[PDB]
Amino acid sequence: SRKESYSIYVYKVLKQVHPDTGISSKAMGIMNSFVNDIFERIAGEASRLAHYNKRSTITSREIQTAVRLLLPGELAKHAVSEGTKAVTKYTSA
Amino acid sequence: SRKESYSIYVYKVLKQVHPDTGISSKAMGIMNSFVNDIFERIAGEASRLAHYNKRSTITSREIQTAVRLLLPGELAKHAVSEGTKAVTKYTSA
Amino acid sequence: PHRYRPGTVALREIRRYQKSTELLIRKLPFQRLVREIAQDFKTDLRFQSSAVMALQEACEAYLVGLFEDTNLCAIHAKRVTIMPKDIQLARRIRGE
Amino acid sequence: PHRYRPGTVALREIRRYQKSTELLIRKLPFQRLVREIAQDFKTDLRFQSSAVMALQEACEAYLVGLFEDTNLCAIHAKRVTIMPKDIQLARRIRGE
Amino acid sequence: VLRDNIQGITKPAIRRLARRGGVKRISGLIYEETRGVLKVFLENVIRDAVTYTEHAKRKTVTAMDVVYALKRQGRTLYGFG
Amino acid sequence: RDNIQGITKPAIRRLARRGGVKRISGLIYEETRGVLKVFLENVIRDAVTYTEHAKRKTVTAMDVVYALKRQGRTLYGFGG
DNA sequence: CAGAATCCCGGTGCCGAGGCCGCTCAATTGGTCGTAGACAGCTCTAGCACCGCTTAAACGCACGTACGCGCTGTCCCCCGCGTTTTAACCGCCAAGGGGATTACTCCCTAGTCTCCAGGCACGTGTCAGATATATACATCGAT
DNA sequence: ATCGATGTATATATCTGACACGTGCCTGGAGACTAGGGAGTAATCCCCTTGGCGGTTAAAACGCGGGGGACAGCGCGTACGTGCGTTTAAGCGGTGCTAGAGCTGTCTACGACCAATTGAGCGGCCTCGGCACCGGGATTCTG
């Protein structure tokens, strides 16, 4: 019954980057499909890496390697930096 | 350690198609890789098809549809007959 | 009377149509074509109103991209008129 | 002495190398090049005897395919000699 | 049954599409080649869409079937969910 | 280093002959070297990334097979 | 119509394909039972059909000059042949860095009941964007 | 040396429903406890990858006779674009029905899981002939 989409979180980010702009439902549809696409690519690559090494669990090492492979050099460096920062804050919470 | 392979099965088939002909080691390695390649492609498509219908079990219908989607027309036309005959005989046993 | 020289209207149309975003093919003739072809596979098929739009968008984007590619191999021959062999060559090099 | 006209030997070589099957790149120069490039990412790396052969086979196949495509682009301009712009055009059309 | 509708893709629409692509001059034979290309393109997508439709035992072709069919060829299309 | 010069002109000619090229202009060599260098660089970066994830120090044939597989080309005959 | 280059008949001999033996652990038959999805029944979305008014678009047309194509012209970037001289080839021997396996053990995730609030529909309204009229002035064209 | 006929852009006032927001509510994320097996550690074995000495040649590098290709010119005729009147049917607005997508609801056919069993499979050693390499010969096709 109740559906599920990222429109709320996209709106929160939009209001944090630009608090004076709104977004049309047509743009919201593209933003919703974009997240499902990148999510599926990363989870796929992480599963292949885990299987080749004969490991039963997925850990941050798999995510970091997958990120280094799929994203270009400049996006990867920043994404990994803040990912590790977030993980450090969570583990230190 | 022990490594599994299909080499004995490839040889049995070759002896049935051409009893007087033999096969070198390189050809055995190529066929042994080709089989795993096609196996992963069909199992992959069957996996996607299972989730879109909310089904939890893979069945022969998924294999038949994947075969019709991946292989060209005439090859699929013959292969589907082979699979149908095999399953029918197995169930009749 | 008044009459423009060859090519000025063509350039004005190019500058016009690259700025706009509307669809260029007629909706109804295309819907008829889609219901024409699908019947060779199965009878009594029905199409949701959005499916025909999705097919039209994919087809228009595909033809536009094919013409963009065809133009590059057309200029290479020091010509300005595009001809069938340019489409055939582009499709051959693309591997389809 | 007997002398063949220009192109007779080229055709003979074409037939010879199309009929053969051996590798065409020297093993030592390629192995040194691979060891040189890898040094920029990580130092003191080691390579198995089969990994260098796999890289060699993949690179040789890729170059042969690119030359096959470039040959069509050369004939289209009514020329016989392939030129850098032909490679640049083939690569641009391929989307590399 | 429609005996023939593919004639309905008009010459002006083809000219307009070539214009969006920046084509300045068009030869008189491009129209029939373009019609043949478009028909060939549509058959390949429709066959898969129908294949998914039949697998689901549905009778109505849905936008999602076209999205998955396009995805299998690598032409993911954004905007239709 | 000078190792890129190890791909001598005759090797390029042999490759072009296999492709059916009858006449070759003298500038094709530097372009071919440039095209090859970027391909090797791209494949090795992925191979080394897989090697480093496994904590190994020797690069095996499987790592190259997977790199090529990710780039979208499958190699038959070396394993997998 | 000469003859460089080619294809291949026939001899020696080798090491890889085929074949066998040894012995283990992946695959089989049997029993248990919890639940995924095959099925019937019911509902109401939107897709299919049908009609009349309007004019943007389409067809069919006239026509003239810009582009596609062709020969005559050329001059030099390369193909083929020979000598130098080489560093790539095999072949034999070094040797300890690293991969593969074993046994130990601890901390990590999966799995479970409890419970209460974040975010998924419905309703509302108002001002952002779609629209009509006027004109500054740039560009294209022939003289 | 030029100027005016066309087309684009921009400036202003009006309307109307798309999106932001407020009210409502329910199902799925957090708290808390537990079991164990998966992962992380050092030690050990052992084999193969990194390097050198040797030497004799397959292959690269150097000059040049001279060619047939890549490049340009002038020439010119007919394919295509631009400007127009007629008329088609898509577009839009509205009415009616129902095929069939979708959902709740019922229950049993199918599968996962444990255990003992055992032979099809892989590990290594052997051997012998299709292949491979060589020579000397007959035949091809270019020129």
Curated annotation (Swiss-Prot), chains A, B:
The modification N6-acetyllysine is found at residue 54. There is a cross-link at residues 3, 89 (Glycyl lysine isopeptide (Lys-Gly) (interchain with G-Cter in ubiquitin)). Glycans are attached at residue 81. The modification Dimethylated arginine is found at residue 48. The modification Phosphoserine is found at residue 5. GO terms for biological process: antibacterial humoral response; antimicrobial humoral immune response mediated by antimicrobial peptide; chromatin organization; defense response to Gram-negative bacterium; defense response to Gram-positive bacterium; innate immune response in mucosa; killing of cells of another organism; negative regulation of tumor necrosis factor-mediated signaling pathway. The modification Phosphothreonine is found at residue 84. The modification Omega-N-methylarginine is found at residues 55, 61. The modification N6,N6,N6-trimethyllysine is found at residue 54. The modification N6-glutaryllysine is found at residues 3, 12, 15, 77, 85, 89. This is Histone H2B type 1-J. It comes from Homo sapiens. The chain holds residues 33 to 125 of 126 of the full protein.
Curated annotation (Swiss-Prot), chains C, D:
The modification N6-lactoyllysine is found at residues 19, 42. Signal peptide: none annotated. Its main location: nucleus. The modification N6-crotonyllysine is found at residue 19. The modification Phosphothreonine is found at residues 43, 70. The keyword Phosphoprotein applies. It is linked to Glioma: Gliomas are benign or malignant central nervous system neoplasms derived from glial cells. They comprise astrocytomas and glioblastoma multiforme that are derived from astrocytes, oligodendrogliomas derived from oligodendrocytes and ependymomas derived from ependymocytes. Core component of nucleosome. Nucleosomes wrap and compact DNA into chromatin, limiting DNA accessibility to the cellular machineries which require DNA as a template. Histones thereby play a central role in transcription regulation, DNA repair, DNA replication and chromosomal stability. DNA accessibility is regulated via a complex set of post-translational modifications of histones, also called histone code, and nucleosome remodeling. This is Histone H3.1. It comes from Homo sapiens.
Curated annotation (Swiss-Prot), chain E:
The nucleosome is a histone octamer containing two molecules each of H2A, H2B, H3 and H4 assembled in one H3-H4 heterotetramer and two H2A-H2B heterodimers. The octamer wraps approximately 147 bp of DNA. Found in a co-chaperone complex with DNJC9, MCM2 and histone H3.3-H4 dimers. Within the complex, interacts with DNJC9 (via C-terminus); the interaction is direct. Interacts with NASP; NASP is a histone chaperone that stabilizes and maintains a soluble pool of Histone H3-H4 dimers. This is Histone H4. Changing residue 71 to Q: In TEBIVANED1; results in severe early developmental defects when expressed in zebrafish embryos; results in defective cell cycle progression when expressed in zebrafish embryos. Belongs to the histone H4 family. One of its GO terms (molecular function) is protein heterodimerization activity. One of its GO terms (biological process) is negative regulation of megakaryocyte differentiation. The lineage of its organism: Eukaryota, Metazoa, Chordata, Craniata, Vertebrata. It comes from Homo sapiens. Changing residue 43 to Q: In a breast cancer sample; somatic mutation. Changing residue 15 to W: In TEBIVANED3; results in early developmental defects when expressed in zebrafish embryos. Keywords: Acetylation, Chromosomal rearrangement, Chromosome, Citrullination, Disease variant, DNA-binding, Hydroxylation, Intellectual disability, Isopeptide bond, Methylation, Nucleosome core, Nucleus, Phosphoprotein, Ubl conjugation. The gene is H4C1.
